[PDB]
Enzyme design. Sequence first.
Site, PDB file in Angstrom:
ATOM      1  N   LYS A 148       0.641  -1.262  -0.003  1.00  0.00           N
ATOM      2  CA  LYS A 148       0.078  -0.096  -0.064  1.00  0.00           C
ATOM      3  C   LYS A 148       0.767   1.269  -0.028  1.00  0.00           C
ATOM      4  O   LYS A 148       0.347   2.145  -0.229  1.00  0.00           O
ATOM      5  CB  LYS A 148      -0.955   0.047   1.274  1.00  0.00           C
ATOM      6  CG  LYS A 148      -2.074  -1.127   1.193  1.00  0.00           C
ATOM      7  CD  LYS A 148      -2.846  -1.050  -0.109  1.00  0.00           C
ATOM      8  CE  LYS A 148      -3.679  -2.253  -0.280  1.00  0.00           C
ATOM      9  NZ  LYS A 148      -4.613  -2.321  -1.423  1.00  0.00           N
ATOM     10  N   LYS A 171       1.497   5.475  -4.649  1.00  0.00           N
ATOM     11  CA  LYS A 171       1.873   4.213  -5.033  1.00  0.00           C
ATOM     12  C   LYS A 171       2.625   4.413  -6.052  1.00  0.00           C
ATOM     13  O   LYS A 171       3.503   3.709  -6.475  1.00  0.00           O
ATOM     14  CB  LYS A 171       0.909   3.179  -5.142  1.00  0.00           C
ATOM     15  CG  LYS A 171       0.066   2.826  -3.696  1.00  0.00           C
ATOM     16  CD  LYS A 171      -1.257   2.073  -3.833  1.00  0.00           C
ATOM     17  CE  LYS A 171      -1.875   2.185  -2.570  1.00  0.00           C
ATOM     18  NZ  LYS A 171      -3.426   1.937  -3.085  1.00  0.00           N
ATOM     19  N   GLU A 181      -6.431  -1.649 -10.501  1.00  0.00           N
ATOM     20  CA  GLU A 181      -7.699  -1.249 -11.337  1.00  0.00           C
ATOM     21  C   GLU A 181      -8.026   0.234 -10.912  1.00  0.00           C
ATOM     22  O   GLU A 181      -9.070   0.698 -11.875  1.00  0.00           O
ATOM     23  CB  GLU A 181      -8.680  -2.092 -11.289  1.00  0.00           C
ATOM     24  CG  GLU A 181      -8.305  -3.360 -11.997  1.00  0.00           C
ATOM     25  CD  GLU A 181      -9.537  -4.392 -12.282  1.00  0.00           C
ATOM     26  OE1 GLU A 181     -10.324  -4.176 -10.999  1.00  0.00           O
ATOM     27  OE2 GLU A 181      -9.739  -5.548 -12.680  1.00  0.00           O
TER      28      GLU A 181
HETATM   29  N1  LIG Z   1      -7.643  -3.988   6.286  1.00  0.00           N
HETATM   30  C1  LIG Z   1      -7.747  -2.841   6.551  1.00  0.00           C
HETATM   31  N2  LIG Z   1      -7.135  -2.405   7.867  1.00  0.00           N
HETATM   32  C2  LIG Z   1      -6.868  -1.188   8.068  1.00  0.00           C
HETATM   33  N3  LIG Z   1      -6.839  -0.073   7.455  1.00  0.00           N
HETATM   34  C3  LIG Z   1      -7.116  -0.448   6.178  1.00  0.00           C
HETATM   35  C4  LIG Z   1      -7.484  -1.795   5.729  1.00  0.00           C
HETATM   36  N4  LIG Z   1      -8.021  -1.765   4.379  1.00  0.00           N
HETATM   37  C5  LIG Z   1      -7.920  -0.413   3.969  1.00  0.00           C
HETATM   38  N5  LIG Z   1      -7.579   0.370   5.000  1.00  0.00           N
HETATM   39  C6  LIG Z   1      -7.247   1.790   4.916  1.00  0.00           C
HETATM   40  O1  LIG Z   1      -7.203   2.222   3.825  1.00  0.00           O
HETATM   41  C7  LIG Z   1      -6.476   3.454   3.390  1.00  0.00           C
HETATM   42  C8  LIG Z   1      -5.627   3.047   2.366  1.00  0.00           C
HETATM   43  O2  LIG Z   1      -6.474   2.558   1.087  1.00  0.00           O
HETATM   44  P1  LIG Z   1      -5.866   1.486   0.041  1.00  0.00           P
HETATM   45  O3  LIG Z   1      -5.952   0.068   0.512  1.00  0.00           O
HETATM   46  O4  LIG Z   1      -4.580   2.033  -0.338  1.00  0.00           O
HETATM   47  O5  LIG Z   1      -6.970   1.726  -1.135  1.00  0.00           O
HETATM   48  P2  LIG Z   1      -8.618   1.129  -1.342  1.00  0.00           P
HETATM   49  O6  LIG Z   1      -9.356   1.993  -0.435  1.00  0.00           O
HETATM   50  O7  LIG Z   1      -8.805  -0.191  -1.296  1.00  0.00           O
HETATM   51  O8  LIG Z   1      -8.958   1.669  -3.120  1.00  0.00           O
HETATM   52  C9  LIG Z   1      -8.605   2.986  -3.695  1.00  0.00           C
HETATM   53  C10 LIG Z   1      -9.153   3.280  -4.719  1.00  0.00           C
HETATM   54  O9  LIG Z   1      -8.810   2.184  -5.630  1.00  0.00           O
HETATM   55  C11 LIG Z   1     -10.400   1.464  -5.987  1.00  0.00           C
HETATM   56  N6  LIG Z   1     -10.160   0.102  -6.267  1.00  0.00           N
HETATM   57  C12 LIG Z   1     -10.381  -0.173  -7.409  1.00  0.00           C
HETATM   58  C13 LIG Z   1     -10.471  -1.589  -7.659  1.00  0.00           C
HETATM   59  C14 LIG Z   1      -9.909  -2.464  -6.614  1.00  0.00           C
HETATM   60  C15 LIG Z   1      -9.481  -1.930  -5.534  1.00  0.00           C
HETATM   61  C16 LIG Z   1      -9.070  -2.718  -4.374  1.00  0.00           C
HETATM   62  O10 LIG Z   1      -8.821  -2.366  -3.251  1.00  0.00           O
HETATM   63  O11 LIG Z   1      -8.875  -3.858  -4.649  1.00  0.00           O
HETATM   64  C17 LIG Z   1      -9.548  -0.647  -5.329  1.00  0.00           C
HETATM   65  C18 LIG Z   1     -11.094   2.380  -4.970  1.00  0.00           C
HETATM   66  O12 LIG Z   1     -12.597   2.212  -5.535  1.00  0.00           O
HETATM   67  C19 LIG Z   1     -10.450   3.388  -4.815  1.00  0.00           C
HETATM   68  O13 LIG Z   1     -10.938   4.512  -5.497  1.00  0.00           O
HETATM   69  C20 LIG Z   1      -5.716   3.505   4.911  1.00  0.00           C
HETATM   70  O14 LIG Z   1      -6.601   4.654   5.671  1.00  0.00           O
HETATM   71  C21 LIG Z   1      -5.848   2.569   5.506  1.00  0.00           C
HETATM   72  O15 LIG Z   1      -5.832   2.528   6.872  1.00  0.00           O
HETATM   73  C1  LIG Z   2      -7.048  -6.700 -10.787  1.00  0.00           C
HETATM   74  C2  LIG Z   2      -6.792  -6.138  -9.300  1.00  0.00           C
HETATM   75  C3  LIG Z   2      -7.040  -4.734  -9.226  1.00  0.00           C
HETATM   76  C4  LIG Z   2      -6.712  -4.247  -7.858  1.00  0.00           C
HETATM   77  N1  LIG Z   2      -6.994  -2.838  -7.472  1.00  0.00           N
HETATM   78  C5  LIG Z   2      -6.472  -2.371  -6.562  1.00  0.00           C
HETATM   79  C6  LIG Z   2      -6.192  -0.897  -6.588  1.00  0.00           C
HETATM   80  O1  LIG Z   2      -6.617  -0.299  -7.335  1.00  0.00           O
HETATM   81  N2  LIG Z   2      -5.844  -0.297  -5.311  1.00  0.00           N
HETATM   82  C7  LIG Z   2      -5.112  -1.213  -4.359  1.00  0.00           C
HETATM   83  O2  LIG Z   2      -4.520  -0.641  -3.311  1.00  0.00           O
HETATM   84  N3  LIG Z   2      -5.204  -2.692  -4.733  1.00  0.00           N
HETATM   85  C8  LIG Z   2      -5.823  -3.245  -5.497  1.00  0.00           C
HETATM   86  N4  LIG Z   2      -5.938  -4.542  -5.714  1.00  0.00           N
HETATM   87  C9  LIG Z   2      -5.280  -5.289  -4.717  1.00  0.00           C
HETATM   88  C10 LIG Z   2      -6.574  -6.271  -3.818  1.00  0.00           C
HETATM   89  O3  LIG Z   2      -7.319  -5.761  -2.893  1.00  0.00           O
HETATM   90  C11 LIG Z   2      -5.724  -7.454  -3.436  1.00  0.00           C
HETATM   91  O4  LIG Z   2      -5.337  -8.312  -4.433  1.00  0.00           O
HETATM   92  C12 LIG Z   2      -6.677  -8.516  -2.502  1.00  0.00           C
HETATM   93  O5  LIG Z   2      -7.241  -7.712  -1.700  1.00  0.00           O
HETATM   94  C13 LIG Z   2      -5.863  -9.710  -1.992  1.00  0.00           C
HETATM   95  O6  LIG Z   2      -4.749  -9.126  -1.353  1.00  0.00           O
HETATM   96  P1  LIG Z   2      -3.269  -9.436  -1.763  1.00  0.00           P
HETATM   97  O7  LIG Z   2      -2.794  -9.060  -2.922  1.00  0.00           O
HETATM   98  O8  LIG Z   2      -2.568  -8.961  -0.554  1.00  0.00           O
HETATM   99  O9  LIG Z   2      -2.945 -11.311  -1.570  1.00  0.00           O
HETATM  100  C14 LIG Z   2      -6.144  -5.112  -6.872  1.00  0.00           C
HETATM  101  C15 LIG Z   2      -5.975  -6.482  -7.233  1.00  0.00           C
HETATM  102  C16 LIG Z   2      -6.311  -7.022  -8.576  1.00  0.00           C
HETATM  103  C17 LIG Z   2      -5.977  -8.154  -8.796  1.00  0.00           C
END
Ligand SMILES: Nc1ncnc2c1ncn2[C@@H]1O[C@H](COP(=O)(O)OP(=O)(O)OC[C@H]2O[C@@H]([n+]3cccc(C(=O)O)c3)[C@H](O)[C@@H]2O)[C@@H](O)[C@H]1O
Ligand SMILES: Cc1cc2nc3c(=O)[nH]c(=O)nc-3n(C[C@H](O)[C@H](O)[C@H](O)COP(=O)(O)O)c2cc1C
Lengths: 216, 216
Positions: free
Chosen positions: A13, A73, A164
Amino acid sequence: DIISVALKRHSTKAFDASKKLTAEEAEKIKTLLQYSPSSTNSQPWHFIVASTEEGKARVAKSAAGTYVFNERKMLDASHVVVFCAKTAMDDAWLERVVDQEEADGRFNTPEAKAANHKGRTYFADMHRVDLKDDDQWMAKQVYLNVGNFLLGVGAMGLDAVPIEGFDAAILDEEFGLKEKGFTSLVVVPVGHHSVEDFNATLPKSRLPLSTIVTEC
Amino acid sequence: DIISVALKRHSTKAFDASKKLTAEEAEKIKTLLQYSPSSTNSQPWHFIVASTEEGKARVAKSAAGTYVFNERKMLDASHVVVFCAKTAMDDAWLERVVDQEEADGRFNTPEAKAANHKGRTYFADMHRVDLKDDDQWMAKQVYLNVGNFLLGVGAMGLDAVPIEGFDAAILDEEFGLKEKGFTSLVVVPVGHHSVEDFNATLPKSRLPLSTIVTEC
Ligand SMILES: Nc1ncnc2c1ncn2[C@@H]1O[C@H](COP(=O)(O)OP(=O)(O)OC[C@H]2O[C@@H]([n+]3cccc(C(=O)O)c3)[C@H](O)[C@@H]2O)[C@@H](O)[C@H]1O
Ligand SMILES: Cc1cc2nc3c(=O)[nH]c(=O)nc-3n(C[C@H](O)[C@H](O)[C@H](O)COP(=O)(O)O)c2cc1C
Ligand SMILES: Nc1ncnc2c1ncn2[C@@H]1O[C@H](COP(=O)(O)OP(=O)(O)OC[C@H]2O[C@@H]([n+]3cccc(C(=O)O)c3)[C@H](O)[C@@H]2O)[C@@H](O)[C@H]1O
Ligand SMILES: Cc1cc2nc3c(=O)[nH]c(=O)nc-3n(C[C@H](O)[C@H](O)[C@H](O)COP(=O)(O)O)c2cc1C
């Protein structure tokens, strides 16, 4: 122990902006992208590898607004790979692929080249003409490449995260990808995590095998 | 070295039916399927692992007729894995994932679960409501798994081949996948190649870096 790698790797992250890949690591991650398998060896893909600060800043423009959590990132990693798929499968690309296979010595007879060509064209035309989903078919090959890549860099001891969460229209326009016939699908920063990578210490979580696996 | 694995693995065209996976290898490949990453940890997949003679023959029905050149791969390999994607993403599935993440200790506070639950659902409805392609989005996560899996079994010293040349409608009906909410996407026989595997001694062929990579 590739299973140990799978259970230890994670989505980083936050990256250390002072830690760079070695020259040898940079060569190896491009080998990983290149040698991924794909249906009919179609290789319907292109990769932007951003390692300069300006290059990474160009990629990071796609992570503005709603995707700002992904911006640092892309700025902080050593090397940022943009995975791109072709937007349409064409006969010029099918020829490029089979001619590369021919030059590499894969066909022992002209019969073998003709059958490989015919078979690939028949299957690509099933997607181009019958299903009209060749763009989706090719994008799936790119996602397979991503999966190969994330495990590969993990086994190299490098940190990475697949993303993504970015504006593909902005990224495509930033690198002129549409005019070239490509579109961005996944951005993968690669490097070494920083202290702000809270996911490094969290346990992994998956659905149990009793749910996702049927043994037959 | 994982780059050695990538440069040495190949799509196996013929398998030695007498060379089974060990019991330990059979347990490892299930963990390998399970722990692939996926967008938002959505894990929108199910896997059939066919190891009995009846099970492998049932999968092989999907390769009869037009896809007959893939039928012996499914019959002769030790284990045959059917990669399946969910046909539709539902709120119940998303809650199942986040409930599993909580049970495994990934959330420090209640403010960490909800921000994760709404971050997963905000991006989930991007493909469910706006782009109406959640089926394609889920399939792409499954292809990513396939890529993780082929490198993984290759690192284990096992032979494999990914197969799109099969009839998914036949395979879906044979295992009742539609009623369970899944559809078959890729078949991957896993085992050890035989001397009839003409592809074991062919050189690998990939497009050159000057074509597929832009450094910036
Ligand atoms: N398990 C956990 N335990 C503790 N804190 C957690 C946490 N998961 C997130 N956080 C918190 O979230 C923040 C960091 O956010 P971060 O994890 O980098 O990112 P996230 O919130 O998961 O997503 C960031 C952007 O990417 C998009 N997106 C698209 C497709 C896939 C994914 C994906 O995650 O797979 C995300 C999502 O819609 C958003 O616009 C910090 O404030 C952190 O504390
Ligand atoms: C196609 C794809 C898109 C993802 N998009 C994001 C993202 O935009 N930002 C992010 O922080 N993590 C993103 N992830 C990470 C996923 O949350 C993560 O792969 C999942 O929670 C499983 O955890 P791990 O990768 O630590 O094993 C993505 C993962 C995949 C495979
Ligand atoms: N490079 C090569 N050099 C020499 N011979 C080569 C050869 N490639 C195939 N052959 C010949 O092919 C025969 C067996 O064919 P084989 O490779 O097993 O398989 P192939 O005929 O290419 O494909 C079997 C079925 O799967 C479908 N399919 C779908 C998606 C992807 C692919 C794919 O291949 O990526 C295929 C295809 O449409 C067909 O219905 C042998 O007799 C062998 O000699
Ligand atoms: C999604 C996918 C589907 C494929 N389908 C078939 C298939 O149906 N039958 C087959 O023998 N090989 C199939 N292949 C193997 C490809 O021809 C092979 O991956 C490609 O030529 C690159 O060679 P390699 O796997 O030996 O590195 C498939 C590969 C992928 C990734």
